Design a protein around this ligand. Sequence first.
Ligand SMILES: [Mg+2]
Ligand SMILES: [Zn+2]
Ligand SMILES: [Zn+2]
Ligand SMILES: [Zn+2]
Ligand SMILES: [Zn+2]
Length: 1341
Amino acid sequence: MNITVELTFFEPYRLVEWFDWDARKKSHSAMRGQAFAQWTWKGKGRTAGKSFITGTLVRSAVIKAVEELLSLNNGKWEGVPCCNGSFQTDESKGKKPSFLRKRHTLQWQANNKNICDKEEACPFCILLGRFDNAGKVHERNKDYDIHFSNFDLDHDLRLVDIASGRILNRVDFDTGKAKDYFRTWEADYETYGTYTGRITLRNEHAKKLLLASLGFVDKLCGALCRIEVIDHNDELRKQAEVIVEAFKQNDKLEKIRILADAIRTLRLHGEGVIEKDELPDGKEERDKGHHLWDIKVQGTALRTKLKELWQSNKDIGWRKFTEMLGSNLYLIYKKETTEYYSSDLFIPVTPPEGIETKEWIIVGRLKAATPFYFGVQQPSDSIPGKEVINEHTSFNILLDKENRYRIPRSALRGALRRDLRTAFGSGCNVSLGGQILCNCKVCIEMRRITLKDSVSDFSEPPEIRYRIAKNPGTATVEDGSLFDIEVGPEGLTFPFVLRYRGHKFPEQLSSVIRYWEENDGKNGMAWLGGLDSTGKGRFALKDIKIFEWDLNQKINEYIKERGMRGKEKELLEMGESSLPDGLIPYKFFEERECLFPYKENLKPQWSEVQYTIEVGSPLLTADTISALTEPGNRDAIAYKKRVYNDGNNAIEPEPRFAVKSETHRGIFRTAVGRRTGDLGKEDHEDCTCDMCIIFGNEHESSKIRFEDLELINGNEFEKLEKHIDHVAIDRFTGGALDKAKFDTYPLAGSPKKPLKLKGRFWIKKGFSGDHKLLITTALSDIRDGLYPLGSKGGVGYGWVAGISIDDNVINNDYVHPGHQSPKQDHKNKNIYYPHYFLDSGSKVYREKDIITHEEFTEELLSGKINCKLETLTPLIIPDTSDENGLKLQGNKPGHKNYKFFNINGELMIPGSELRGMLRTHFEALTKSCFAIFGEDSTLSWRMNADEKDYVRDKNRVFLNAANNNRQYLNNIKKSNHDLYLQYLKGEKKIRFGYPVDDQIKKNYEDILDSYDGIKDQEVAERFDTFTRGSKLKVGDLVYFHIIDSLIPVRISRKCASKTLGGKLDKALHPCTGLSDGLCPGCHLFGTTDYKGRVKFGFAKYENGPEWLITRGNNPERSLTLGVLESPRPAFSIPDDESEIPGRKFYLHHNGWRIIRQKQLEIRETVQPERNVTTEVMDKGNVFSFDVRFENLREWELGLLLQSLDPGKNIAHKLGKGKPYGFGSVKIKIDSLHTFKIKRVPQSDIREYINKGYQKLIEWSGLPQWHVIPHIDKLYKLLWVPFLNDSKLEPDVRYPVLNEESKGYIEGSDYTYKKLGDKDNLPYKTRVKGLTTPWSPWNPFQ
RNA sequence: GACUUAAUGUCACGGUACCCAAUUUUCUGCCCCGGACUCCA
RNA sequence: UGGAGUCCGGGGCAGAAAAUUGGGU
Ligand SMILES: [Mg+2]
Ligand SMILES: [Zn+2]
Ligand SMILES: [Zn+2]
Ligand SMILES: [Zn+2]
Ligand SMILES: [Zn+2]
């Protein structure tokens, strides 16, 4: 009579808001969700409600199951025949049912003995309820021979808790882009998948059928089902407000956008990175510590504050805590800074009796051969019932409530439908709302196909792929083009289930299954999910097992076992013996070569072109966000990915380094666009160019799918990642810039041990020969080194040495006159300053027509220069990765000792060093701006006691006054200690208005901040100059001069009216942006807004005396240098009247001989921490490097070639110890190749340099280069007296501080007390001496 | 009971949150003169 | 009434500026 039945889901079932049948047509979502579960609210506010399943829907499922069961049994179930049943209600006779069947009614041959009526009816009619008192309108529950009550959820209830709203999708087959999308709620089957209802049956006769119907109901509301008969976020936001405010107080608001990312990356790490303080620490002996994690938040370090927050918010998970903290920081930073839904006929279907209906069940694992991405809408708008950018992660991956990676049934089904459409060779676009089922083969097969929403046993956080778009014109980041994608790890396995209820297993579905397989010799081709063009979600079907239900003769076993819906993983795990009766292994699965649609449509659909890139230089695809959260404190580290190991069932411990499929695809796209000119198109809207056809428009899809360039040589390298320090040298002073010092952590590539990056891309079937040739040409361009991988390509990083495709796919004869002073002084009695300042002049030529990188301009030159750098003096390029390279830190604590710069044991000159030295020389040649300048640096000079505006009884009186004052102070201290404290600070008067400008008060603040006291803090605090501290405030007893100077004490330091940037002329300032133009140096070598057109590779050593060899040093090849101290602009600019002298250039001298011959003295007198020990090259060492230039004008190329090889006796200065004579390097061009690849003859090279000279003459207003005054000064600055057969050995050294200081030459005036004195040497004469190169300084000219 | 179904008709497993974009642009691991404040003849 | 003086010591920066999403169906 009455039975209670529970329907249990095994997929996230579809939930829609319940509406009355009259009110349902108003909303399209409810029209779509008629076959879904229905959610009805309670109360107001749309927050609480109950979910249920209408008994009409369960009745429809039961009726479909009964129709199927009777068709397989030819209308006779359990020996009692059933008629075809009636499924047509005429409007005139009665009201139409609320749901009208648009599908084929699966009929049979009616063998009923008598026509069914109210008195007698077959079980089909009883279950249909044709003849009971109940009709279309409902009166009472006792009028139903069959009654399906509403199925109420068993477990107030909140919609967001039960269901999650997700935008689904319809994707066009031809273009690969979505035609439209729609929203659905996917409720939790794990917690809310059981719905209990009541079915009443007045007529017991049909009972045996009805129960079986519950067995054959496979899916309901979008989920496979079986029917059985029986606020921390607010607190985190407030804390993130505190952190953002603390960053604001430090003027570091932008770093919050960094922090909000890094905090999120912490979710990949465990809580230990906060609990065990595994965040990177700052540099050794650094007061500020880490630039991010040591930022003081409410007076405590950011790492400590994060630890306190984690302890406070330990109630929520570490992943949730870090996600919400990063999101809140992101939102506070942001604040502080086609939905398509959806003639009745009764079409019978009578399958032939001879043909039998079976059910195939295919189980397996979808393993992500590449990182997968299943797009989902942001959690902000994913709230069910609710259907500033406020999205921390741009692209979020689809997960569960348990954070498990989920492949939705919808995405898997859509990918399978696409693959089936390809395999059949033809198909239809899925039409929505069609009253007639589509007759296409694809749709017919898909109606028989059921798939299971697969979720992984892996819940670890997704990795973040950072994608940018390069601006083709300037080859820099497009403005606004930066986003993050949540991607699941590759190798992750999902339980794949595919049921096919059909007469025979189609050949095309077998072809698709074989296509998705990898087996042994093929690759899995299940392009599930999105971002496929960037090689996302290429899945492989593995561990496959296909079984068979004989539904025509063994249907009862299927009904009993419910088709094992929800037990498919157990079936995959179980063996052949444990299979249930009626489920036999399907051993007829045709092999891969047997499927005609596979070889004719699926095998050639995506052709795999796999290759290996040999990178002969260090490769840095920067991952800064990970570097912020990882130990080592590196500003940029190489990108590494998390790979899931199925065998270990966990992420592999050591990440796989790779050049991103996004980076790979972008490199290829840029190559193709530049070779075709399509990259230069302003917009690609409704475009059809070759680049758009190959790589996809906003409407079509990419015909080429790039995957990651996995590093496969990593095991070979003993130290895979190389630490390369970089610095920016101020143009005016040869010292480093104030804040521009950093370090990179690329992969240690080298010409002898290149990094092998194996990567593949898939070519769409039917690719044009033009497009295939374009792809091959782009691959050759990568092979030819045109496009370096990763960042710092212009500095030498990521230079591609070669490419292996898989089998199954000149001298400059100028002799400079030199300087007359060293030539006349053949006995070398004169002494010259180690550095002199070249003032080319304030006039700087800026070109506003910026040469673009969007194409290789035909008239402009593009090629490679092979040059032979040769050291004329010992070269010191220290490998500052390890400050203990020589392993003498233990013997001498605090002593920095480096090896020569080497990658994998072979000596090198980093291309950044060569690029910087050549850039300095070129900017001196072309009168370019001071690209690197300490503009913020101020100037201060000690004033002596002069300050020309332009005994026993006295000692006893002083002593008595001091004693009386101390007695008074002690008496007041006895009276009140605080009163004495104030008296000493001057807050209160002790018995016995010139306005202050902002700049003057700022000068006082800098004097206080730059005050250099005693080193020892114990004596410093007592003996330091006592001021109330920090900034000038009300009540500070101070000194002033008419006012001009606000000094804390008498005889303090004068401060300059203008900073160093103010001292420098306006035209010489570094170029900012591109609107005002770029100087020749900044146009050639590039700026922050414009990528440079010259890339300097790493200079590899070949031959020569390998090292400078010396007895004294512990390493015989090493050498200890003198005290290299910071350049003093106060000497070059003695007073505020003096202007910036110009670029600092160091003389070419054998002053290293003095250092080498005085090694014991340098080691004994100099404190170990002050000086450094280095591995040192010798004279004659030969390195070779490549200057890869693109779109270079003829005069630009000529000037660059003149910069490389200036003349016969003109060389350069490179590496450490330049003021000590080290680094005199002679560069000689072996060859100049230019492609449009042809070697340029010497005559053409000379014509380039000759017409480069013409540009210099034009700017000033075989060529002699010294006729140009500033070029003459620059070349004598770089003239090498000892290079030729000349016997000149000039004495070039810094003066000592005073006579008593060590190193003072006895009897000479070469002392800084003498030279800094205005009487012995006035300021203007000193500046003139510093400005005229090779001016004698011991006898001053 | 009701919330919440209508019964001779639910292909919604009828729909891939899909397509487009190079974590990159610039930078010499570099370097010499200062660093303090008073004293009373 | 103004006189100019007493010291030989000492590291620095260690990332900066940008882009942090836009279009489509
Ligand atoms: Mg009825
Ligand atoms: Zn009947
Ligand atoms: Zn179709
Ligand atoms: Zn185009
Ligand atoms: Zn410039």
